[PDB]
Amino acid sequence: KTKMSFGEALEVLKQGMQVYRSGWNGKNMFLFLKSSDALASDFGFGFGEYINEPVFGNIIFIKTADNKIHAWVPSQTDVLAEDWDIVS
Amino acid sequence: MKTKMSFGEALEVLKQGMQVYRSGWNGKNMFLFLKSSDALAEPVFGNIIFIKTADNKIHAWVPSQTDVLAEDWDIVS
Amino acid sequence: PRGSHMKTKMSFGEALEVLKQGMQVYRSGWNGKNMFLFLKSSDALASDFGFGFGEYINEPVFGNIIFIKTADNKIHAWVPSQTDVLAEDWDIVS
Amino acid sequence: LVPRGSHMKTKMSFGEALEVLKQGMQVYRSGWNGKNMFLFLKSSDALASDFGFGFGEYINEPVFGNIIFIKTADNKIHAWVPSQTDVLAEDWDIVS
């Protein structure tokens, strides 16, 4: 009960909080969930020309120590791990 | 009473040995199952989640983002 | 001066390179249609999402991101499954 | 009889590393900060052998496709999930 399951971490992400695994080899990495922005477009955010442009759905990002943001690919250990926590 | 499950519940189902699937999946006859370390076997195997596809093949599963966020999970019965 | 198609098969590697040249790719085996991958660079994503301009120390910037457009007219970040990666039924969106 | 070839210092894309993995060789990204890590592929028949399942005698029996594993730094073998930078990277190399 000290650290969480991936499922609980999912729930925290879905609430809008950031989440990370202590097991991760490093610091200042964490996940966050960008909810669907329909304003995001190839023609610049908020300046979409076509009404049926595809909409970005939810995306989970991983922010790395490089201060970079990538789309997160959940690894099998990540989804089975039990060392998830909230960043604060 | 809840009508379908989150991925976390599905994982618990998986950890019990059961097969799970998403209703939103395009394919039919498709599900996940968890193989424990010991049956897999100083490198020590971990658990591996497998996806079985309609083509009757089995691959290591790479969880998609939609999959992880979805709530249309179910037990294969 | 224009080439000719020698082979049906395309591996992920060839698909990848095409993606990095800013081109779109998809798999014949996929269940569904009008599904394809694309790649967005750091700068293209700053412009598309309206965030990640790098004017602040300690403000993160987008890396390169591969997306998948699904039939729902939705975009999600692309998870490279073992099957996708090993497949050799890739084709360029033309 | 056979002269030795030179190592050139060039590193390759994931596409190339995959073909190598499909030739049965092991690979690894330099960019991974850890050591003693590598991918390896296991083919369908080697997998039916090594778990004892899926030799094709039954119709509705399933066969293990190809599988990329990764031996970790911690001496664990797991099914490998490629990160996106993994996929886009060009610091891949063959294990010698």
PDB file of N, CA, C and O in Angstrom, chain B residues 20-74:
ATOM      1  N   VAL B  20      -8.258 -12.108 -21.230  1.00  0.00           N
ATOM      2  CA  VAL B  20      -8.955 -10.857 -21.348  1.00  0.00           C
ATOM      3  C   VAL B  20      -8.952 -10.263 -22.747  1.00  0.00           C
ATOM      4  O   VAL B  20      -8.063 -10.477 -23.512  1.00  0.00           O
ATOM      5  N   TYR B  21      -9.989  -9.538 -23.058  1.00  0.00           N
ATOM      6  CA  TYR B  21     -10.124  -8.908 -24.336  1.00  0.00           C
ATOM      7  C   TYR B  21     -10.798  -7.540 -24.275  1.00  0.00           C
ATOM      8  O   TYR B  21     -11.495  -7.249 -23.344  1.00  0.00           O
ATOM      9  N   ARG B  22     -10.579  -6.722 -25.276  1.00  0.00           N
ATOM     10  CA  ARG B  22     -11.286  -5.469 -25.375  1.00  0.00           C
ATOM     11  C   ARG B  22     -12.384  -5.574 -26.389  1.00  0.00           C
ATOM     12  O   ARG B  22     -12.191  -6.071 -27.467  1.00  0.00           O
ATOM     13  N   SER B  23     -13.543  -5.101 -26.033  1.00  0.00           N
ATOM     14  CA  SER B  23     -14.653  -5.097 -26.940  1.00  0.00           C
ATOM     15  C   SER B  23     -14.383  -4.214 -28.159  1.00  0.00           C
ATOM     16  O   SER B  23     -14.746  -4.577 -29.258  1.00  0.00           O
ATOM     17  N   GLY B  24     -13.714  -3.097 -27.969  1.00  0.00           N
ATOM     18  CA  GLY B  24     -13.376  -2.196 -29.043  1.00  0.00           C
ATOM     19  C   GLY B  24     -12.372  -2.685 -30.040  1.00  0.00           C
ATOM     20  O   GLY B  24     -12.091  -2.011 -31.000  1.00  0.00           O
ATOM     21  N   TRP B  25     -11.764  -3.816 -29.769  1.00  0.00           N
ATOM     22  CA  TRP B  25     -10.850  -4.396 -30.708  1.00  0.00           C
ATOM     23  C   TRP B  25     -11.500  -4.780 -31.993  1.00  0.00           C
ATOM     24  O   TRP B  25     -12.631  -5.262 -32.024  1.00  0.00           O
ATOM     25  N   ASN B  26     -10.811  -4.515 -33.078  1.00  0.00           N
ATOM     26  CA  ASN B  26     -11.351  -4.804 -34.384  1.00  0.00           C
ATOM     27  C   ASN B  26     -11.469  -6.250 -34.680  1.00  0.00           C
ATOM     28  O   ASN B  26     -12.469  -6.719 -35.190  1.00  0.00           O
ATOM     29  N   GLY B  27     -10.447  -6.970 -34.315  1.00  0.00           N
ATOM     30  CA  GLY B  27     -10.413  -8.369 -34.591  1.00  0.00           C
ATOM     31  C   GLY B  27     -11.292  -9.219 -33.757  1.00  0.00           C
ATOM     32  O   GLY B  27     -11.782  -8.777 -32.733  1.00  0.00           O
ATOM     33  N   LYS B  28     -11.529 -10.435 -34.217  1.00  0.00           N
ATOM     34  CA  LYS B  28     -12.310 -11.378 -33.477  1.00  0.00           C
ATOM     35  C   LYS B  28     -11.355 -12.404 -33.001  1.00  0.00           C
ATOM     36  O   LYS B  28     -10.231 -12.406 -33.429  1.00  0.00           O
ATOM     37  N   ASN B  29     -11.783 -13.250 -32.087  1.00  0.00           N
ATOM     38  CA  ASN B  29     -10.955 -14.328 -31.593  1.00  0.00           C
ATOM     39  C   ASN B  29      -9.609 -13.808 -31.203  1.00  0.00           C
ATOM     40  O   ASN B  29      -8.591 -14.311 -31.626  1.00  0.00           O
ATOM     41  N   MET B  30      -9.611 -12.833 -30.319  1.00  0.00           N
ATOM     42  CA  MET B  30      -8.377 -12.155 -29.987  1.00  0.00           C
ATOM     43  C   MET B  30      -8.358 -11.984 -28.483  1.00  0.00           C
ATOM     44  O   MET B  30      -9.349 -11.518 -27.912  1.00  0.00           O
ATOM     45  N   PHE B  31      -7.256 -12.337 -27.825  1.00  0.00           N
ATOM     46  CA  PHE B  31      -7.266 -12.074 -26.387  1.00  0.00           C
ATOM     47  C   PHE B  31      -5.846 -12.066 -25.852  1.00  0.00           C
ATOM     48  O   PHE B  31      -4.917 -12.521 -26.506  1.00  0.00           O
ATOM     49  N   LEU B  32      -5.704 -11.623 -24.620  1.00  0.00           N
ATOM     50  CA  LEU B  32      -4.443 -11.664 -23.893  1.00  0.00           C
ATOM     51  C   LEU B  32      -4.424 -12.812 -22.888  1.00  0.00           C
ATOM     52  O   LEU B  32      -5.452 -13.170 -22.303  1.00  0.00           O
ATOM     53  N   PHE B  33      -3.227 -13.326 -22.625  1.00  0.00           N
ATOM     54  CA  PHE B  33      -3.077 -14.222 -21.502  1.00  0.00           C
ATOM     55  C   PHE B  33      -1.686 -14.022 -20.929  1.00  0.00           C
ATOM     56  O   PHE B  33      -0.760 -13.645 -21.640  1.00  0.00           O
ATOM     57  N   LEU B  34      -1.544 -14.285 -19.643  1.00  0.00           N
ATOM     58  CA  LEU B  34      -0.306 -14.106 -18.920  1.00  0.00           C
ATOM     59  C   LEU B  34       0.396 -15.438 -18.716  1.00  0.00           C
ATOM     60  O   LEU B  34      -0.186 -16.368 -18.145  1.00  0.00           O
ATOM     61  N   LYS B  35       1.646 -15.531 -19.159  1.00  0.00           N
ATOM     62  CA  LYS B  35       2.482 -16.688 -18.875  1.00  0.00           C
ATOM     63  C   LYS B  35       3.483 -16.316 -17.790  1.00  0.00           C
ATOM     64  O   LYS B  35       4.252 -15.354 -17.939  1.00  0.00           O
ATOM     65  N   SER B  36       3.466 -17.082 -16.708  1.00  0.00           N
ATOM     66  CA  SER B  36       4.350 -16.912 -15.565  1.00  0.00           C
ATOM     67  C   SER B  36       5.802 -17.230 -15.923  1.00  0.00           C
ATOM     68  O   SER B  36       6.104 -17.959 -16.880  1.00  0.00           O
ATOM     69  N   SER B  37       6.705 -16.656 -15.120  1.00  0.00           N
ATOM     70  CA  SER B  37       8.146 -16.887 -15.245  1.00  0.00           C
ATOM     71  C   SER B  37       8.494 -18.365 -15.404  1.00  0.00           C
ATOM     72  O   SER B  37       9.211 -18.756 -16.340  1.00  0.00           O
ATOM     73  N   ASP B  38       8.018 -19.198 -14.473  1.00  0.00           N
ATOM     74  CA  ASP B  38       8.548 -20.551 -14.344  1.00  0.00           C
ATOM     75  C   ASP B  38       8.297 -21.379 -15.604  1.00  0.00           C
ATOM     76  O   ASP B  38       9.205 -22.054 -16.110  1.00  0.00           O
ATOM     77  N   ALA B  39       7.073 -21.331 -16.134  1.00  0.00           N
ATOM     78  CA  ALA B  39       6.776 -22.075 -17.352  1.00  0.00           C
ATOM     79  C   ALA B  39       7.567 -21.537 -18.537  1.00  0.00           C
ATOM     80  O   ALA B  39       7.809 -22.268 -19.508  1.00  0.00           O
ATOM     81  N   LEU B  40       7.964 -20.259 -18.484  1.00  0.00           N
ATOM     82  CA  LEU B  40       8.802 -19.699 -19.540  1.00  0.00           C
ATOM     83  C   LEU B  40      10.186 -20.351 -19.555  1.00  0.00           C
ATOM     84  O   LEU B  40      10.651 -20.820 -20.602  1.00  0.00           O
ATOM     85  N   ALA B  41      10.844 -20.406 -18.395  1.00  0.00           N
ATOM     86  CA  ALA B  41      12.179 -20.981 -18.244  1.00  0.00           C
ATOM     87  C   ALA B  41      12.272 -22.421 -18.770  1.00  0.00           C
ATOM     88  O   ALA B  41      12.722 -22.656 -19.899  1.00  0.00           O
ATOM     89  N   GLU B  42      22.863 -14.506 -14.246  1.00  0.00           N
ATOM     90  CA  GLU B  42      21.949 -15.639 -14.336  1.00  0.00           C
ATOM     91  C   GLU B  42      20.541 -15.189 -14.719  1.00  0.00           C
ATOM     92  O   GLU B  42      19.696 -15.020 -13.839  1.00  0.00           O
ATOM     93  N   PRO B  43      20.300 -14.988 -16.018  1.00  0.00           N
ATOM     94  CA  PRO B  43      19.013 -14.435 -16.461  1.00  0.00           C
ATOM     95  C   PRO B  43      17.799 -15.241 -16.010  1.00  0.00           C
ATOM     96  O   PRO B  43      17.689 -16.451 -16.244  1.00  0.00           O
ATOM     97  N   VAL B  44      16.870 -14.532 -15.368  1.00  0.00           N
ATOM     98  CA  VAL B  44      15.616 -15.070 -14.851  1.00  0.00           C
ATOM     99  C   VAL B  44      14.479 -14.468 -15.683  1.00  0.00           C
ATOM    100  O   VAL B  44      14.355 -13.236 -15.768  1.00  0.00           O
ATOM    101  N   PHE B  45      13.653 -15.328 -16.297  1.00  0.00           N
ATOM    102  CA  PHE B  45      12.480 -14.844 -17.028  1.00  0.00           C
ATOM    103  C   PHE B  45      11.508 -14.125 -16.099  1.00  0.00           C
ATOM    104  O   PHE B  45      11.329 -14.494 -14.937  1.00  0.00           O
ATOM    105  N   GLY B  46      10.867 -13.087 -16.638  1.00  0.00           N
ATOM    106  CA  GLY B  46       9.717 -12.481 -16.010  1.00  0.00           C
ATOM    107  C   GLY B  46       8.433 -13.066 -16.577  1.00  0.00           C
ATOM    108  O   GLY B  46       8.434 -13.952 -17.424  1.00  0.00           O
ATOM    109  N   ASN B  47       7.322 -12.560 -16.064  1.00  0.00           N
ATOM    110  CA  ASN B  47       6.041 -12.843 -16.673  1.00  0.00           C
ATOM    111  C   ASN B  47       5.996 -12.211 -18.054  1.00  0.00           C
ATOM    112  O   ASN B  47       6.622 -11.189 -18.305  1.00  0.00           O
ATOM    113  N   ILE B  48       5.254 -12.820 -18.961  1.00  0.00           N
ATOM    114  CA  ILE B  48       5.105 -12.256 -20.285  1.00  0.00           C
ATOM    115  C   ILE B  48       3.648 -12.271 -20.639  1.00  0.00           C
ATOM    116  O   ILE B  48       2.965 -13.276 -20.430  1.00  0.00           O
ATOM    117  N   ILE B  49       3.158 -11.161 -21.122  1.00  0.00           N
ATOM    118  CA  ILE B  49       1.789 -11.097 -21.569  1.00  0.00           C
ATOM    119  C   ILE B  49       1.796 -11.384 -23.049  1.00  0.00           C
ATOM    120  O   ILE B  49       2.561 -10.785 -23.812  1.00  0.00           O
ATOM    121  N   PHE B  50       0.886 -12.219 -23.472  1.00  0.00           N
ATOM    122  CA  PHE B  50       0.843 -12.668 -24.841  1.00  0.00           C
ATOM    123  C   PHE B  50      -0.482 -12.245 -25.413  1.00  0.00           C
ATOM    124  O   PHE B  50      -1.476 -12.207 -24.697  1.00  0.00           O
ATOM    125  N   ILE B  51      -0.494 -11.907 -26.688  1.00  0.00           N
ATOM    126  CA  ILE B  51      -1.728 -11.656 -27.399  1.00  0.00           C
ATOM    127  C   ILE B  51      -1.861 -12.753 -28.430  1.00  0.00           C
ATOM    128  O   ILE B  51      -0.897 -13.088 -29.126  1.00  0.00           O
ATOM    129  N   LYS B  52      -3.049 -13.300 -28.502  1.00  0.00           N
ATOM    130  CA  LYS B  52      -3.347 -14.301 -29.446  1.00  0.00           C
ATOM    131  C   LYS B  52      -4.245 -13.667 -30.424  1.00  0.00           C
ATOM    132  O   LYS B  52      -5.223 -13.080 -30.076  1.00  0.00           O
ATOM    133  N   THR B  53      -3.926 -13.839 -31.676  1.00  0.00           N
ATOM    134  CA  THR B  53      -4.647 -13.170 -32.698  1.00  0.00           C
ATOM    135  C   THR B  53      -5.529 -14.079 -33.485  1.00  0.00           C
ATOM    136  O   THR B  53      -5.421 -15.261 -33.371  1.00  0.00           O
ATOM    137  N   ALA B  54      -6.408 -13.526 -34.291  1.00  0.00           N
ATOM    138  CA  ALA B  54      -7.374 -14.309 -35.072  1.00  0.00           C
ATOM    139  C   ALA B  54      -6.739 -15.214 -36.060  1.00  0.00           C
ATOM    140  O   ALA B  54      -7.331 -16.180 -36.476  1.00  0.00           O
ATOM    141  N   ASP B  55      -5.510 -14.924 -36.404  1.00  0.00           N
ATOM    142  CA  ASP B  55      -4.777 -15.741 -37.300  1.00  0.00           C
ATOM    143  C   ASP B  55      -4.226 -16.942 -36.555  1.00  0.00           C
ATOM    144  O   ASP B  55      -3.359 -17.619 -37.076  1.00  0.00           O
ATOM    145  N   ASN B  56      -4.634 -17.138 -35.310  1.00  0.00           N
ATOM    146  CA  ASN B  56      -4.130 -18.222 -34.476  1.00  0.00           C
ATOM    147  C   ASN B  56      -2.657 -18.140 -34.132  1.00  0.00           C
ATOM    148  O   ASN B  56      -2.024 -19.136 -33.875  1.00  0.00           O
ATOM    149  N   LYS B  57      -2.123 -16.947 -34.079  1.00  0.00           N
ATOM    150  CA  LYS B  57      -0.752 -16.784 -33.654  1.00  0.00           C
ATOM    151  C   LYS B  57      -0.600 -16.068 -32.319  1.00  0.00           C
ATOM    152  O   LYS B  57      -1.486 -15.402 -31.875  1.00  0.00           O
ATOM    153  N   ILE B  58       0.525 -16.253 -31.687  1.00  0.00           N
ATOM    154  CA  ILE B  58       0.762 -15.646 -30.424  1.00  0.00           C
ATOM    155  C   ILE B  58       1.998 -14.776 -30.401  1.00  0.00           C
ATOM    156  O   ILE B  58       3.077 -15.221 -30.718  1.00  0.00           O
ATOM    157  N   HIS B  59       1.835 -13.538 -29.983  1.00  0.00           N
ATOM    158  CA  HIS B  59       2.944 -12.612 -29.980  1.00  0.00           C
ATOM    159  C   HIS B  59       3.067 -12.012 -28.606  1.00  0.00           C
ATOM    160  O   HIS B  59       2.090 -11.981 -27.864  1.00  0.00           O
ATOM    161  N   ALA B  60       4.276 -11.629 -28.230  1.00  0.00           N
ATOM    162  CA  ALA B  60       4.395 -10.786 -27.062  1.00  0.00           C
ATOM    163  C   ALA B  60       3.508  -9.579 -27.292  1.00  0.00           C
ATOM    164  O   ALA B  60       3.387  -9.090 -28.409  1.00  0.00           O
ATOM    165  N   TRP B  61       2.832  -9.146 -26.255  1.00  0.00           N
ATOM    166  CA  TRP B  61       1.872  -8.070 -26.390  1.00  0.00           C
ATOM    167  C   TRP B  61       2.549  -6.748 -26.123  1.00  0.00           C
ATOM    168  O   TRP B  61       3.286  -6.614 -25.139  1.00  0.00           O
ATOM    169  N   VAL B  62       2.309  -5.776 -26.991  1.00  0.00           N
ATOM    170  CA  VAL B  62       2.760  -4.413 -26.714  1.00  0.00           C
ATOM    171  C   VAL B  62       1.513  -3.585 -26.395  1.00  0.00           C
ATOM    172  O   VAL B  62       0.699  -3.326 -27.290  1.00  0.00           O
ATOM    173  N   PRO B  63       1.284  -3.239 -25.141  1.00  0.00           N
ATOM    174  CA  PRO B  63       0.029  -2.528 -24.803  1.00  0.00           C
ATOM    175  C   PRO B  63      -0.049  -1.195 -25.539  1.00  0.00           C
ATOM    176  O   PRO B  63       0.932  -0.472 -25.643  1.00  0.00           O
ATOM    177  N   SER B  64      -1.163  -0.969 -26.219  1.00  0.00           N
ATOM    178  CA  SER B  64      -1.362   0.309 -26.855  1.00  0.00           C
ATOM    179  C   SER B  64      -1.887   1.324 -25.828  1.00  0.00           C
ATOM    180  O   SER B  64      -2.380   0.978 -24.744  1.00  0.00           O
ATOM    181  N   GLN B  65      -1.785   2.595 -26.190  1.00  0.00           N
ATOM    182  CA  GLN B  65      -2.253   3.668 -25.306  1.00  0.00           C
ATOM    183  C   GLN B  65      -3.754   3.609 -25.174  1.00  0.00           C
ATOM    184  O   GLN B  65      -4.295   3.646 -24.058  1.00  0.00           O
ATOM    185  N   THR B  66      -4.463   3.465 -26.302  1.00  0.00           N
ATOM    186  CA  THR B  66      -5.913   3.302 -26.176  1.00  0.00           C
ATOM    187  C   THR B  66      -6.242   2.106 -25.260  1.00  0.00           C
ATOM    188  O   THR B  66      -7.079   2.227 -24.350  1.00  0.00           O
ATOM    189  N   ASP B  67      -5.526   0.975 -25.426  1.00  0.00           N
ATOM    190  CA  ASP B  67      -5.777  -0.223 -24.631  1.00  0.00           C
ATOM    191  C   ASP B  67      -5.671   0.078 -23.148  1.00  0.00           C
ATOM    192  O   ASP B  67      -6.522  -0.298 -22.360  1.00  0.00           O
ATOM    193  N   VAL B  68      -4.559   0.680 -22.762  1.00  0.00           N
ATOM    194  CA  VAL B  68      -4.288   1.047 -21.385  1.00  0.00           C
ATOM    195  C   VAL B  68      -5.346   1.994 -20.829  1.00  0.00           C
ATOM    196  O   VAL B  68      -5.758   1.861 -19.662  1.00  0.00           O
ATOM    197  N   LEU B  69      -5.818   2.942 -21.641  1.00  0.00           N
ATOM    198  CA  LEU B  69      -6.833   3.862 -21.141  1.00  0.00           C
ATOM    199  C   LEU B  69      -8.239   3.305 -21.237  1.00  0.00           C
ATOM    200  O   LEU B  69      -9.145   3.872 -20.636  1.00  0.00           O
ATOM    201  N   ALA B  70      -8.457   2.229 -21.987  1.00  0.00           N
ATOM    202  CA  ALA B  70      -9.841   1.910 -22.284  1.00  0.00           C
ATOM    203  C   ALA B  70     -10.517   1.248 -21.085  1.00  0.00           C
ATOM    204  O   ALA B  70      -9.894   0.909 -20.071  1.00  0.00           O
ATOM    205  N   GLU B  71     -11.834   1.104 -21.202  1.00  0.00           N
ATOM    206  CA  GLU B  71     -12.622   0.543 -20.124  1.00  0.00           C
ATOM    207  C   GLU B  71     -13.652  -0.398 -20.684  1.00  0.00           C
ATOM    208  O   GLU B  71     -14.718  -0.576 -20.094  1.00  0.00           O
ATOM    209  N   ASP B  72     -13.344  -0.986 -21.840  1.00  0.00           N
ATOM    210  CA  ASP B  72     -14.158  -2.017 -22.464  1.00  0.00           C
ATOM    211  C   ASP B  72     -13.526  -3.406 -22.343  1.00  0.00           C
ATOM    212  O   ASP B  72     -13.677  -4.238 -23.244  1.00  0.00           O
ATOM    213  N   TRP B  73     -12.763  -3.638 -21.283  1.00  0.00           N
ATOM    214  CA  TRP B  73     -12.114  -4.921 -21.098  1.00  0.00           C
ATOM    215  C   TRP B  73     -13.130  -5.929 -20.576  1.00  0.00           C
ATOM    216  O   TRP B  73     -14.139  -5.570 -19.994  1.00  0.00           O
ATOM    217  N   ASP B  74     -12.846  -7.207 -20.796  1.00  0.00           N
ATOM    218  CA  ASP B  74     -13.788  -8.267 -20.488  1.00  0.00           C
ATOM    219  C   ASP B  74     -13.013  -9.555 -20.401  1.00  0.00           C
ATOM    220  O   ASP B  74     -11.890  -9.653 -20.890  1.00  0.00           O
TER     221      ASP B  74
END
